[PDB]
Amino acid sequence: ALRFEALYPEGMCPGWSVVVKGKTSSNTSMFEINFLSHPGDQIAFHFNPRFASSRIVCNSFLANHWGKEEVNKTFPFEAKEPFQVEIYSDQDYFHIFIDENKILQYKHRQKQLSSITKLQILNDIEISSVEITKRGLY
Amino acid sequence: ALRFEALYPEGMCPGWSVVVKGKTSSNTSMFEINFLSHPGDQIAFHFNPRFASSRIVCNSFLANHWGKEEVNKTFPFEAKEPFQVEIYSDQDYFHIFIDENKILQYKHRQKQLSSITKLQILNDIEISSVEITKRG
Numbered sequence: 001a002l003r004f005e006a007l008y009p010e011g012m013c014p015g016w017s018v019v020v021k022g023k024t025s026s027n028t029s030m031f032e033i034n035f036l037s038h039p040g041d042q043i044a045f046h047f048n049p050r051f052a053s054s055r056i057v058c059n060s061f062l063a064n065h066w067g068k069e070e071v072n073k074t075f076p077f078e079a080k081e082p083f084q085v086e087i088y089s090d091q092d093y094f095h096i097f098i099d100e101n102k103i104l105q106y107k108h109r110q111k112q113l114s115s116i117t118k119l120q121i122l123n124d125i126e127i128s129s130v131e132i133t134k135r136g137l138y
Numbered sequence: 139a140l141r142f143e144a145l146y147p148e149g150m151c152p153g154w155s156v157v158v159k160g161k162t163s164s165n166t167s168m169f170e171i172n173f174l175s176h177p178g179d180q181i182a183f184h185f186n187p188r189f190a191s192s193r194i195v196c197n198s199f200l201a202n203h204w205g206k207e208e209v210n211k212t213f214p215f216e217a218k219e220p221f222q223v224e225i226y227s228d229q230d231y232f233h234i235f236i237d238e239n240k241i242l243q244y245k246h247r248q249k250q251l252s253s254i255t256k257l258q259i260l261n262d263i264e265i266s267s268v269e270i271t272k273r274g
């Protein structure tokens with residue numbers, strides 16, 4: 001189910017950081033953080049830790065379908081243990097830091113960054129905080 | 139216009155903080171932060187700093203009408219300068235702070251606190267941060 005959604009119509013990319021703190025309930029489920037663009041609620045960036053396999057799957061949902069999965073074996077999550085995920089965007093990538101360590105970068109596929117106005121968090125995450133902050137560029 | 143909206147379907151009241159950082163663009167416009175209840179996006183709490191008169195108005199839209207306005211004694215905001223406002227809810231009030239100093243408390247009128255699932259920010263505020271945190 002949808003756990004959290006935010007809308008910032010002026011565009012929350014590039015140059016914004018999103019920090020999500022929480023924990024899972026289960027050791028076999030998953031959660032996801034999505035950045036959506038208008039029109040059409042296309043998913044510019046989907047970040048999906050899958051606890052059953054301890055893999056992070058990232059992708060984009062453009063033209064009504066997923067593209068190529070980018071799968072990461074770095075999995076700094078454990079069931080029921082609090083975590084902090086920070087996602088920051090520049091002109092070129094989304095950058096993911098978990099528990100203050102850099103984990104991965106995901107190259108933009110949706111180039112219309114300013115049309116990314118929505119953040120969505122779904123499935124097995126008990127959220128303690130969401131922060132959305134303008135951090136500038138380099 | 140709508141500047142920001144957040145939805146937490148499990149209910150973001152009581153026992154949550156919302157911290158908004160930003161600044162106004164004008165010397166004499168206004169902005170508002172509204173907490174909305176489900177179903178219907180109903181205005182459980184409306185917080186409205188009005189820079190033309192330098193007055194804060196708080197109210198609720200309940201039983202089909204706006205209630206009695208609470209006009210705050212003080213107006214600590216300065217236009218065109220960054221501020222940090224926090225709204226924290228307990229069982230009895232919304233508590234509002236600027237620079238971590240309390241400005242006012244507003245007694246809950248909508249008692250269905252758990253149905254308050256949305257935060258909405260409208261009009262003259264250039265947002266630099268929104269933080270929504272469960273205080274537990």
Ligand SMILES: OC[C@H]1O[C@@H](O[C@H]2[C@H](O)[C@@H](O)[C@@H](O)O[C@@H]2CO)[C@H](O)[C@@H](O)[C@H]1O
Pocket residue numbers: 046048057058059066068069
């Ligand atoms: O690529 C990201 C998404 O994957 C979807 O699941 C895929 C699955 O990973 C793949 O192995 C195959 O079975 O097709 C599935 C459907 O496309 C998820 O459903 C979706 O939520 C994204 O995570």
